[PDB]
């Protein structure tokens with residue numbers, strides 16, 4: 001066991017009430033909103049296929065030119081209450097907001113840089129309006145924060161000289177200032193989700209990542225801090241050199257998910273996945289015909305897949321420059337919400353069930369040993385195979401939305417056929433099992 | 440690398456026309472019929488829940504008392520042409536018939552024992568009648584043969600004395616005599632599927648199992664012989680001490696199948712699974728309420744699973760003592776044929792497709808590189824995920840029964856969405872793909 005000053009801090013999962021809330025929430029929304037919404041993937045007449053929030057990179061735009069977009073930042077249709085209504089109706093329990101993305105433009109009126117909402121035609125504290133509106137709807141707010149900052153020339157990607165070292169030290173102090181500011185201005189914040197922390201410069205400052213975690217924890221009782229922030233003494237990220245998870249939850253499943261048979265290790269720690277609706281667009285991109293766009297069921301599948309293996313899922317939205325949401329995203333949130341209103345009991349506050357995966361869908365476990373079958377693929381055999389772990393029997397099955405009893409037939413030892421409902425629900429649906437453990 | 444005299448004889452899969460036919464047939468029926476069909480799992484007022492064809496063992500019936508059932512053997516409803524019609528309409532391309540099971544009662548009038556159909560009130564050569572009738576329908580016939588024989592007291596489970604040695608020698612001669620007799624009486628036989636070869640007496644005599652294979656291949660050109668017969672110089676069964684398959688196909692998947700993700704190794708050799716409709720009954724049992732009984736779709740799922748992993752499937756029937764089939768088996772055969780009539784292009788002459796398994800069902804691959812999606816679990820997403828191997832693309836998709844066109848949308852690198860059809864086909868169905876390598 002290798003010695004470390006800046007390695008993991010939790011022994012297993014946190015079970016304090018604030019962490020339990022973070023976990024039980026299960027479903028979140030991600031908001032990527034920044035100056036990139038304005039060009040929306042197009043620069044100087046050329047539409048770039050890469051992620052819209054990286055347009056400065058794709059189009060090789062210098063900082064001063066890029067940040068000049070602030071002069072155009074005027075989201076006149078923005079209404080925080082409406083955004084918070086959209087989230088509440090979707091059935092999200094929390095929202096993660098880009099306080100600052102790689103571009104460096106802050107959505108709050110920071111005292112530490114001029115590149116903020118205050119210095120735009122719009123002027124208003126967007127971040128603050130969102131925090132209050134979301135909290136008024138009972139929705140927790142989590143802050144995304146990019147460490148990498150393309151607006152501060154003291155940023156370095158690596159330390160290759162004596163001068164790189166000095167400038168980077170200034171950069172960390174600046175970052176510290178912004179972080180403490182965010183924590184003090186908005187003390188209802190429940191999580192900091194760090195990104196842009198992969199560069200060798202950060203990896204060589206493991207100590208700073210440990211300090212950032214602790215500082216924010218000192219400021220905000222019960223705050224969660226993600227693993228992506230963290231590098232240890234050796235510069236190993238997420239998990240330390242002893243293989244132990246740093247931060248409060250693992251945060252590397254991004255537009256992908258663990259395999260339901262081969263990656264059961266994920267059930268040993270808290271974890272949160274994030275996803276996009278198109279293939280890889282976080283910020284607003286004007287042309288979604290450029291890649292595949294996911295349907296609501298394809299998204300709900302991923303949400304349930306996450307919970308079924310002990311994880312949260314956050315579904316991303318890229319708001320328009322004018323402050324409204326594009327039709328496809330309004331369609332998505334409505335549809336997710338209709339389904340979550342019906343079937344959410346098998347998502348919120350649910351967890352890994354301990355059953356072998358079957359082809360029809362996913363199991364989730366409730367707080368009082370309910371086992372939910374979430375059926376995404378309807379068998380023509382009209383029978384849903386349930387193989388039970390050693391010592392577990394199925395006593396009853398119920399269609400969740402109607403209460404109607406479902407036939408359960410033993411087929412071999414440790415195996416049942418659970419009947420499909422007599423009328424096809426016509427959408428993914430839930431059957432609830434009552435189970436019994438021996439001994 | 441261990442030198443063997445009685446190990447594997449093939450390198451890889453046989454590819455002579457006889458073996459190609461064995462393989463392309465894909466769907467077989469099993470018939471377990473013998474004296475056990477008379478009591479049907481009940482003896483002296485006790486119904487036994489175990490496999491009816493083992494009732495002699497469950498009820499501890501002495502050989503003399505058990506073989507007396509021969510006096511009650513009179514299958515008045517038997518008609519080999521009706522049996523052949525039932526098979527043909529099920530879509531079975533071959534039938535494996537118990538020439539004799541463990542009980543030792545022979546379905547053909549053997550010269551080498553008194554315990555045959557000849558010495559019953561029915562008298563007739565059931566086996567010969569079946570062989571002709573199946574053959575006239577274009578159906579290949581395979582012979583199940585139990586080496587273990589509870590009717591011959593020279594049988595031994597192990598050889599631990601001079602008397603054991605002398606007796607078991609007589610038994611091997613007898614067995615050789617019956618095998619030669621079957622091969623010469625019925626020269627259209629396409630396969631011998633040996634069973635009851637698990638005892639130490641057989642394992643210790645690997646030479647003999649190699650001899651029986653060779654003897655029969657010489658008598659019946661192109662004949663197939665199952666791995667279950669065979670033990671090598673070291674007593675290792677099915678696969679020899681160098682890990683190589685003995686006989687012509689692997690024959691251990693009995694009432695179970697290989698895992699579609701973890702057991703892709705089975706694709707390297709020919710193999711044949713068998714299954715029962717109830718949990719474990721091969722011969723006729725009078726009470727099918729004692730265990731779970733599979734539905735037709737549950738059976739078709741297993742057939743398709745087998746072909747998807749390069750294997751044959753044989754579905755068992757246990758005819759009634761009277762020569763007719765029980766209502767549940769008639770319904771099964773009919774339902775399977777109906778489906779095979781619609782979707783058989785994706786089963787017959789098909790094989791493993793080399794694609795990663797998906798939740799909606801199975802891939803099979805046709806002879807002209809067609810790739811069939813056989814769908815058992817309809818996604819509410821209206822999309823069927825197809826992840827292609829490195830360097831393969833999907834060019835069209837088609838509802839097999841209606842010809843109707845199917846949208847194929849690329850989702851990421853090496854992944855597609857295939858739409859369901861506009862009308863839910865309403866049962867397991869087939870969508871056919873054209874693919875392209877580079």
Ligand SMILES: OC[C@@H]1[NH2+][C@@H](CO)[C@@H](O)C(O)[C@@H]1O
Nearest residue numbers: 051053054195196254274282
């Ligand atoms: O997970 C969200 C995602 N994180 C980074 C790529 O991993 C960012 O570069 C990207 O723009 C986006 O914010």
Ligand SMILES: OC[C@@H]1[NH2+][C@@H](CO)[C@@H](O)C(O)[C@@H]1O
Nearest residue numbers: 490492493634635693713721
């Ligand atoms: O595969 C068919 C099966 N084989 C033996 C058990 O494995 C026999 O004991 C059984 O009766 C049946 O014939």
